[PDB]
Structure formats: structure tokens, C-alpha cells
């Protein structure tokens, strides 16, 4: 099955998956020169007040905190997009060391991690649905660097010993994921994918510009997970994150002069 290793990480992923070799994959590198200022995108509405998350989940990949999504609660509008979409889930992509484990890339800058808030167009009634459309989700990006602690991510990383290795859970309610977001809301647009398996076309990219800082040893925490699961060898969860992939025919637009 696929995975972050050397014998099945992203570059052998399209013998499952040709869409991996597609004209809108993601995740890519942000050549911030190029990339226009578009006076016609809005501010990004992003209402978490009464979001509920249920769970976290390690899934052999990353870890998922999931979120009730069935009511109209935790919502992204406005950006670029054209009606709403809910909050189901987010998750981390991480390096081994700092200077890498950001998918998105700025220059060609790698941050140490980087958040992905997944939500649904809601048109689509459902999550299934939305991955077959091509406007089916949004996924708010959010770089991580290393400095001082983020106070709203500990919470996430005292959970985590709990939840060490694949198919693990815990119940998780109450968390605030306003906690994760940078102070300013300025942005970068682009159409993409999902960047795992199976890799659908469906993402309108919203890559936030200001990173989050979180301190060393809160990564380090994220890198004590394990991709395996319990009584099988330890493989320490790091560097589960896709390369930059071919900007094809796509423009990157921005929020801000
Ligand atoms: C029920 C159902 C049906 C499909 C195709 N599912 C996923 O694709 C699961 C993977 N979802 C996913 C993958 C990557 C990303 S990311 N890393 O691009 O934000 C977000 C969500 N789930
Ligand atoms: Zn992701």
C-alpha cells in the first residue's frame, strides 16, 4: 500500500493513482514574483465558533481531528470561493528535522510543517460526493515554524501519546481550531488535488501567508507518532508529505498587494 517510504512514497504513487501525473496536483511551490494580486478575491470567511470536533485518529499517515459535520457549523466562504463549505477534519504534514515537511512550498521555501483544514462544498450533501466534483472542497493551508510555542496546538500534542500508532483514537470534543490560525487572513488561490491517495482533482487551495510559529518540542512530539500499528516495528511518523508537483496550465492568484 502507499506510504512515506522508500519503496512506496509519492514517487511510486501514480502506478495506483495515474491522476498523480494530472494537470491540477498538488501540492506546488509558490513563486510569489509570479503569482498576480486579484482585486476581485474577498476576504476569507472562516466562522469556527461552534465548531465540534469528536476524535482523533492516527491513520497511518498523519493524524485526523475530526469534527461533526453534520449541521451547519465550523464554515470557510468568501475567499475565492462561491458558496460554503464545512469543516470535517484536520491534520499536519511534518518533516524529520525543521528544515523540511511543508507540502506547499514559497520560493522554494520548505517550513517544518504545515496544517490543512479540509472542509466540503455543501451543495455536494457530503464529503464522498464533494471528491468527485471538481469544486468539492477547500483546504485552508497553514505553514508551520519552529519558535515559540503555539498554546492552542498543545492540547493536540498532549493527545498524542494516546494515539501512537495506525488505527488508534481517543475521543477529543472541545477543541477550538481558531487556536491554529495566523493573525492575518491574507492568502494564496490556486486549483489543486488532494495530495494522498487517491489524489482527486477537487481542491480549491487557500494557502494562508503568515506561518503559525510552534515550539521544537512540540514537533518533536508529532514526530514520536508511528506510521505502524501496535506490536509491529517502529517506524517513526516524519516526512509524510508530497513534493511540490508541475504547476501545468494553473495560475497561483493572491489576496494582497
Ligand atoms: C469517504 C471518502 C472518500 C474519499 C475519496 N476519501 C478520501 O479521499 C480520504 C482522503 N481525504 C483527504 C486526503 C488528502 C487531503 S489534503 N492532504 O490534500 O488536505 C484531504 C483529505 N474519503
Ligand atoms: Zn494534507
Do not use: A, C
Given at each position: 500500500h502507499w506510504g512515506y517510504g522508500k519503496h512506496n512514497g509519492p514517487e511510486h504513487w501514480h502506478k495506483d493513482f495515474p491522476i498523480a501525473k494530472g494537470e491540477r496536483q498538488s501540492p506546488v511551490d509558490i513563486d510569489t514574483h509570479t503569482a498576480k494580486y486579484d482585486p476581485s478575491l474577498k476576504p476569507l470567511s472562516v466562522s469556527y465558533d461552534q465548531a465540534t470536533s469528536l476524535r482523533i485518529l492516527n491513520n497511518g499517515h498523519a493524524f485526523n481531528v475530526e469534527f461533526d459535520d453534520s449541521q451547519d457549523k465550523a464554515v470557510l466562504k468568501g475567499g475565492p470561493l462561491d458558496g460554503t463549505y464545512r469543516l470535517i477534519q484536520f491534520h499536519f504534514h511534518w518533516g524529520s528535522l525543521d528544515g523540511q515537511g511543508s507540502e506547499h512550498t514559497v520560493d522554494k521555501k520548505k517550513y517544518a510543517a504545515e496544517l490543512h483544514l479540509v472542509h466540503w462544498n455543501t451543495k455536494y450533501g457530503d464529503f464522498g460526493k464533494a471528491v468527485?466534483?471538481?469544486?468539492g472542497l477547500a483546504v485552508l493551508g497553514i505553514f508551520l515554524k519552529v519558535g515559540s510555542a503555539k498554546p492552542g496546538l498543545q492540547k493536540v500534542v498532549d493527545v498524542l501519546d494516546s494515539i501512537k500508532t495506525k488505527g488508534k483514537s481517543a475521543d477529543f470534543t472541545?477543541?477550538?481550531?481558531?487556536?491554529?490560525?495566523?493573525?492575518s487572513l491574507d492568502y494564496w488561490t490556486y486549483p489543486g488535488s488532494l495530495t494522498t491517495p487517491p489524489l482527486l482533482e477537487c481542491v480549491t487551495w487557500i494557502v494562508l501567508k503568515e506561518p503559525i510559529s510552534v515550539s521544537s518540542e512540540q514537533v518533536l512530539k508529532f514526530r514520536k507518532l508511528n506510521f505502524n500499528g501496535e506490536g509491529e516495528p517502529e517506524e517513526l511518523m516524519v516526512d509524510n508529505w508530497r513534493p511540490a508537483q508541475p504547476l501545468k496550465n494553473r495560475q497561483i492568484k493572491a489576496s494582497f498587494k
Open positions: 468527485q466534483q471538481p469544486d472541545n477543541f477550538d481550531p481558531r487556536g491554529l490560525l495566523p493573525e
